[PDB]
Amino acid sequence: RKLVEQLKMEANIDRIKVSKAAADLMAYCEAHAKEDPLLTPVPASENPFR
Amino acid sequence: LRQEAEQLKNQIRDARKACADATLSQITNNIDPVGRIQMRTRRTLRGHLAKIYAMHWGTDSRLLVSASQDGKLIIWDSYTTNKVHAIPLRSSWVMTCAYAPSGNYVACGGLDNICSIYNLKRVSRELAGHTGYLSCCRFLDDNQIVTSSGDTTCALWDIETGQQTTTFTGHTGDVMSLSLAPDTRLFVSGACDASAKLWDVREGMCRQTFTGHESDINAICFFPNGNAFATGSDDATCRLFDLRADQELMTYSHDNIICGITSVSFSKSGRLLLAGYDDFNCNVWDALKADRAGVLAGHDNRVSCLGVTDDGMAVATGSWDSFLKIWN
Amino acid sequence: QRNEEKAQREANKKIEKQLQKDKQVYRATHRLLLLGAGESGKSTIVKQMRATKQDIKNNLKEAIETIAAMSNLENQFRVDYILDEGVRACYERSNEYQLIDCAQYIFETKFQVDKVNFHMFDVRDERRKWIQCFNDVTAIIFVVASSSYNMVTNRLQEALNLFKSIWNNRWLRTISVILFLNKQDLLAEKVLAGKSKIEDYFPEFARYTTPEEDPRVTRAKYFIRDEFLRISTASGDGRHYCYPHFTCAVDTENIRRVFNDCRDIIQRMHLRQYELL
Amino acid sequence: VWVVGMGIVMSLIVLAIVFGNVLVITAIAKFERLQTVTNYFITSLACADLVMGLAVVPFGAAHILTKTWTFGNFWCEFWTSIDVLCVTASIETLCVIAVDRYFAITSPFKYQSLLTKNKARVIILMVWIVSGLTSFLPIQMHWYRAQEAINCYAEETCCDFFTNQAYAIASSIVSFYVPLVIMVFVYSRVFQEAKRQLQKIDKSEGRHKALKTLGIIMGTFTLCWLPFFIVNIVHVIQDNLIRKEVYILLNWIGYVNSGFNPLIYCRSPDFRIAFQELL
Ligand SMILES: CN[C@@H]1CCc2c(ccc(O)c2O)[C@H]1O
């Protein structure tokens, strides 16, 4: 019986367009990609490991 | 009777299909590929008794904690490659591990249906309200600890109180992995019944519940933006869901890939998704381009866990061969 | 300044020294898993291998609660207070209705080391994903109730279905299985007396015959093993061996029986390596 | 031109012994998985084979093919000492590995406990150390020296060895004869254990290859050294019996055993795993 209530809870949800969500996530992956050592390895001196 | 819930299920599915306007791959096609990525073991971390099941980066990123089936829990200093503290676990078998954002306490799970938090600076408390084995433990602060168990009920304990403050229950299958978001408000938990639902710590109600996969869900992790997360099924396919869209954004799967998935973790920028397997290799795929970029297979046995530091400097990966390789 | 690195070295040396000491202990210890079906009585052989009183009353109260027997089908007022002639019918109906406690009346263990230290322990989940976490156990004691055909798909068939789950898992691709036909005397007891023949539960029983106590029980005794052997026969290819020796109600040698079977478990494992045999 | 053609075959033998043992030795350190428990002895045998192959074998080809031992007299004696240890190591290492298989199967539940990584180094070093007492005499001491071709020791041209009858009997025993008793006895008891297991499984299940599998391990070792060491003891007691050319032919028969050693030693998926990265 709770599932009917649970489904009713999720029946009305504010939904964002998948195209809009994709673009925002793409920008979040675009503007924030600069500070990513995995994307571009830094100097062995800068990297504590190497 | 139950048809209304089935009608509601059809109504929910209709909204998601209607909300779908364009495909992620179509939008991400113009995005330039990351290219081939080669990783090496800048450190070769090893020296444990038996096969390990968990690994978790510290908040300061200097230390990592790994727990093995041998019952020995040891916190390992990545830079010096020298073990810092080795604390034995009362339970013979452990299934999960966690590290404090403050770094004061280290939490180790257990298959003995009891969760215990250890004090680095002497076990502090033992929690056993949940039934069955504990799947994943992770606590945002030194007061609230989130553990997902095999009783299909994940609850957030109070470290000071030692009792279940709230209970997030009603999940179909056994919960196998729990992931916390940087916002610390909402957390997504994955169960063995292919259902991936995101809870709210204060509300205690499943705001969204996704069931895109067919097989059991193995692990889940959030993106840095905290608006989406990725999960890996027991089937070869792993998918990423956009919370605001409540749908499966992109399906990640290679025809050659047929083995199981045991871990999942994004990068600091989130572009590079590193996915472990039972095929002794970890594959790093582009989150936006939805294509495989590079593979690494340093481990010899099945990879158990994988994580990325808060700073994002380098990735770690577990292994059932007792050798955890710190890739960079 | 640099003393910090030296200090960590001493701690690392101390940790490594302590870990090295425990390495011999862990390798010496042999780990077993007791995967037993419900009502099979795995605890009985576990007790035999190894203020209480209100323990007897709790089982009696649990049996009285099941003696729920009226729901399955004067004293009713007496039954209401607790919640005989009805007991005999309930005992007869106990074949269908589950009665864990005997009408007559992560747990661990440290088995006697003897030659080599052995610490056995057990772990009700339908998914049973916990099994896949175990791949280093030398062998798994799989206690099965022989007199399960009368109970309940029959209970024995459900127990036989465990092998399909156990062996097709492929996670335990190098772990042998030891099974005890528990309640062997009880299995013959129902078999020896006139009752519902196993042919009614297992249709192919009549076609089966004894391989090369009364023969009625003796023929029945082998058939359950043969059915269990047939599943274990296919897809073995070494490293997966079933040691099906029976187990009576009381047999103190059962602990010694495992050790003899345990030696063959390790020896066959080594012979698999180097392709010697 | 017969020597030139013969040298071509001899050239391959030196090359074969080089890569044959090195590849197994390279895999032992390249992959950490196989490095720890076993093949640690097999590396010592491989290391012993490399010394016999890369150093002792080619100079022998130079000795026979060329007019004489053009090199110095001191290195001529040095070659015999280095050759003695390498041949003594491979036989001993095979016996040590032979004990490894027997001591595990015949006494389980204690093999894992008793054997240790430090204990493996002690036994492996003891094989080399025991080889030291076999190689100490020819170089440091002069008890090796023989009037039959006595000038050969003095001459710088011919480096052929003539040894005292006392040394030949004792050295041959410590090298091949004694481990033969250990290798055969240990493996014979093993064959009983495998036979017992097969019979037990036959009774357990209503529905041998071991003899062939254990045959190659003992057969190859016997068929490559027995004709040599039989001849070695023969000439020391009966000098007129042996033919000089016959001694050299059997001498190079036993050197091929180190080249064919890896096939008996490491032929399994782990060895096949080694070829995986090198392909
Ligand atoms: C060319 N003949 C060599 C030198 C003498 C010698 C050999 C093998 C084993 C021994 O114990 C020896 O003393 C032969 O490999």
Swiss-Prot record, chain A:
Membrane in keyword set: yes
Gene Ontology cellular-component terms listed: extracellular exosome; heterotrimeric G-protein complex; membrane; plasma membrane; synapse
Protein encoded by which gene: GNG2
Subcellular location: Cell membrane
Molecular function GO terms recorded: G-protein beta-subunit binding
Keywords, alphabetical: Acetylation, Cell membrane, Host-virus interaction, Lipoprotein, Membrane, Methylation, Prenylation, Transducer
Species of the source: Homo sapiens (Human)
GO BP, one annotated term: adenylate cyclase-activating dopamine receptor signaling pathway
Transmembrane domains' residue ranges: none
Protein's job: Guanine nucleotide-binding proteins (G proteins) are involved as a modulator or transducer in various transmembrane signaling systems. The beta and gamma chains are required for the GTPase activity, for replacement of GDP by GTP, and for G protein-effector interaction.
The name this protein goes by in its record: Guanine nucleotide-binding protein G(I)/G(S)/G(O) subunit gamma-2
Family: Belongs to the G protein gamma family.
Parent-record interval covered: 13 to 62 of 71
Membrane topology: Lipid-anchor
Keyword Ligase included in the entry's annotation: no
Free-text tissue specificity from the UniProt record: Expressed in fetal tissues, including testis, adrenal gland, brain, white blood cells and brain.
UniProtKB/Swiss-Prot annotation, chain B:
Each WD repeat, start to end: 40-88, 89-128, 129-169, 170-211, 212-255, 256-297, 298-328
Reported effect, residue 100 to T: In MRD42; decreases receptor-driven G protein activation; decreases complex formation with gamma subunit; decreases trimer formation with alpha and gamma subunit; no effect on protein abundance
Effect of residue 74 to T: In MRD42; also found in patient with hematologic malignancies; reduces interaction with GNAI2, GNAI3, GNA13 and GNA11; induces activation of PI3K-AKT-mTOR and MAPK pathways
UniProt PTM: Phosphorylation at His-254 by NDKB contributes to G protein activation by increasing the high energetic phosphate transfer onto GDP.
Keyword Zinc-finger found: no
SUPFAM superfamilies membership: WD40 repeat-like
Effect caused by changing residue 85 to R: In MRD42; uncertain significance; no effect on protein abundance; no effect on complex formation with gamma subunit; no effect on trimer formation with apha and gamma subunits; no effect on receptor-driven G protein activation
Keywords: Acetylation, Disease variant, Host-virus interaction, Intellectual disability, Phosphoprotein, Repeat, Transducer, WD repeat
Effect of residue 112 to G: In MRD42; decreases receptor-driven G protein activation; no effect on protein abundance; no effect on complex formation with gamma subunit; no effect on trimer formation with alpha and gamma subunits
GO molecular function, one term: protein-containing complex binding
Cited Pfam families: WD40_Gbeta
Sites bearing Phosphohistidine, chain numbering: 254
Sequence similarity: Belongs to the WD repeat G protein beta family.
Species of the source: Homo sapiens
Gene name, Swiss-Prot/TrEMBL: GNB1
From Swiss-Prot, chain C:
Catalytic reaction list: GTP + H2O = GDP + phosphate + H(+)
Region (G4 motif): 178-185
EC number: 3.6.5.-
GO CC terms: cytoplasm; cytosol; extracellular exosome; heterotrimeric G-protein complex; membrane; plasma membrane; trans-Golgi network membrane
Principal place of residence: membrane
Domain G-alpha, chain residue ranges per copy: 28-277
Phosphoserine: modified positions: 235
Glycyl lysine isopeptide (Lys-Gly) (interchain with G-Cter in ubiquitin), cross-linked positions: 190
PROSITE patterns, per the entry: G_ALPHA
Annotated positions binding Mg(2+): 43
Annotated GO MF terms: adenylate cyclase activator activity; D1 dopamine receptor binding; G protein activity; G-protein beta/gamma-subunit complex binding; GTP binding; GTPase activity; metal ion binding
An example Gene Ontology biological process: adenylate cyclase-activating adrenergic receptor signaling pathway
Cellular localisation: Cell membrane
Listed Pfam families: G-alpha
Binding-site positions, GTP: 36-44, 182-185, 249
Region (G3 motif): 118-124
Effect of mutating residue 249 to S: In PHP1A; the patient also shows testotoxicosis; constitutively activates adenylyl cyclase in vitro; rapidly degraded at 37 degrees resulting in loss of Gs activity
InterPro entries: Gprotein_alpha_S, Gprotein_alpha_su, GproteinA_insert, P-loop_NTPase
Similarity comment: Belongs to the G-alpha family. G(s) subfamily.
Entry's disease: Albright hereditary osteodystrophy: A disorder characterized by short stature, obesity, round facies, brachydactyly and subcutaneous calcification. It is often associated with pseudohypoparathyoidism, hypocalcemia and elevated PTH levels.
Protein name per UniProt: Guanine nucleotide-binding protein G(s) subunit alpha isoforms short
Organism: Homo sapiens (Human)
Curated annotation (Swiss-Prot), chain D:
Coiled-coil portions: none
Modifications made to the protein after synthesis: Palmitoylated. Palmitoylation may reduce accessibility of phosphorylation sites by anchoring the receptor to the plasma membrane. Could be depalmitoylated by LYPLA1 at the plasma membrane.
Membrane topology listed for this record: Multi-pass membrane protein
Cysteines paired by S-S bonds: 76-159, 152-158
Biological process annotations from GO: adenylate cyclase-activating adrenergic receptor signaling pathway; adenylate cyclase-modulating G protein-coupled receptor signaling pathway; adrenergic receptor signaling pathway; AMPA selective glutamate receptor signaling pathway; bone resorption; brown fat cell differentiation; cell surface receptor signaling pathway; cellular response to amyloid-beta
Cytoplasmic topological domain residue ranges: 29-41, 100-120
Phosphotyrosine: residues carrying this PTM: 111
Extracellular topological segments: 66-76, 145-164, 238-244
Signal peptide: none
Domain of life: Eukaryota
Annotated binding of (S)-timolol, by residue: 83, 88, 232, 251, 255
Record's keyword terms, sorted: Cell membrane, Disulfide bond, Endosome, G-protein coupled receptor, Glycoprotein, Golgi apparatus, Hydroxylation, Lipoprotein, Membrane, Palmitate, Phosphoprotein, Receptor, Transducer, Transmembrane, Transmembrane helix, Ubl conjugation
GO MF entries: adenylate cyclase binding; amyloid-beta binding; beta2-adrenergic receptor activity; identical protein binding; norepinephrine binding; potassium channel regulator activity; protein homodimerization activity; protein-containing complex binding
Chain positions recorded as (S)-carazolol binding sites: 83, 171, 251
Subcellular location: Cell membrane; Early endosome; Golgi apparatus
One GO CC term, this protein: cilium
Main location: membrane
The name this protein goes by in its record: Beta-2 adrenergic receptor
Gene name for this UniProt entry: ADRB2
